[PDB]
Design a protein. Structure first.
Ligand SMILES: CN(C)CCc1c[nH]c2cccc(O)c12
Length: 262
């Protein structure tokens, strides 16, 4: 089965990135700490949420014995997915100011800025995910449907995606446009490599996560069986981003390539 492969890849990649950050004195800078936070969030996603999803697949999408695990499982899934998404959004926003104003960004760059960045993204992720255990356990219908564990709150699914993958998405495309504008208008080879890396990262993020959110919104604003079957695969397409984020955010460095090979 090609789902155990996904969980193994997620765990191994995030563990290796955390090891590379921790064991190398040359990689302890303000950006790599945020990258390690991304790795931690992706590892938690791949360890706590994904194998339970494979177990749900193995039982024909019939929940295992403890019914109380559904609401907390949805909480953890949404929390870690949002944490990854606005981690990427913060990375893009930080790169825009690093490229447009390098001197001022370096002058204002500090450990305090990185800690503020981390707490800001995690605080927004916590605020977005807040109602799920408050109301998911108060009413079992909001987290169950036809005997399968899935959230069935139409209003939250519509607005809760409008501040998780559509306002962050608008920010990310605007930032991508402004950065490719900035990097183009001996030192040009570095800028070309940076533009290529930014394009690969942005387009992979969009192509992996956008299908799931698009069909999720289409399942509410609008077929039901087809859309559900599509969601069942697109959620794992999105989960695979946790196994792709470390490799595309770290392996372009020779230090990370050497550490992975050690
Ligand atoms: C299913 N899982 C990949 C979580 C994705 C998610 C992030 N934020 C949300 C807000 C509402 C409904 C959701 O599925 C989400």
């Amino acid at each position: 089965l090609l789902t155990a492969v996904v969980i193994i890849l997620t765990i191994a990649g995030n563990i290796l990135v955390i090891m590379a950050v921790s064991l190398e004195k040359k990689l302890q800078n303000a950006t790599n700490y945020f990258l390690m936070s991304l790795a931690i969030a992706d590892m938690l996603l791949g360890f706590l949420v994904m194998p339970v999803s494979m177990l749900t697949i193995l039982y024909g999408y019939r929940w295992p014995l403890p019914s109380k695990l559904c609401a907390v499982w949805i909480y953890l899934d949404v929390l870690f997915s949002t944490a990854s998404i606005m981690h990427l959004c913060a990375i893009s926003l930080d790169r825009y100011v690093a490229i447009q104003n390098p001197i001022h960004h370096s002058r204002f760059n500090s450990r305090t800025k990185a800690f503020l960045k981390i707490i800001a993204v995690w605080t927004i992720s916590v605020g977005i995910s807040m109602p799920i255990p408050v109301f998911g356990l108060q009413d079992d219908s909001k987290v169950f449907k036809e005997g399968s564990c899935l959230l069935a709150d139409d209003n939250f699914v519509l607005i809760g995606s409008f501040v998780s993958f559509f306002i962050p998405l608008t920010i990310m495309v605007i930032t991508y446009f402004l950065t490719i504008k900035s990097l183009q208008k001996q030192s040009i080879s570095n800028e070309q490599k940076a533009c290529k890396v930014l394009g690969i990262v942005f387009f992979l993020f969009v192509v992996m996560w956008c299908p799931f959110f698009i069909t999720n919104i289409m399942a509410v604003i609008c077929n039901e069986d087809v859309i559900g079957a599509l969601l069942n695969v697109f959620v794992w397409i999105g989960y695979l981003s946790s196994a792709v984020n470390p490799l595309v955010y770290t392996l372009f460095n020779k230090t990370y390539r050497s550490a992975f090979s050690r």
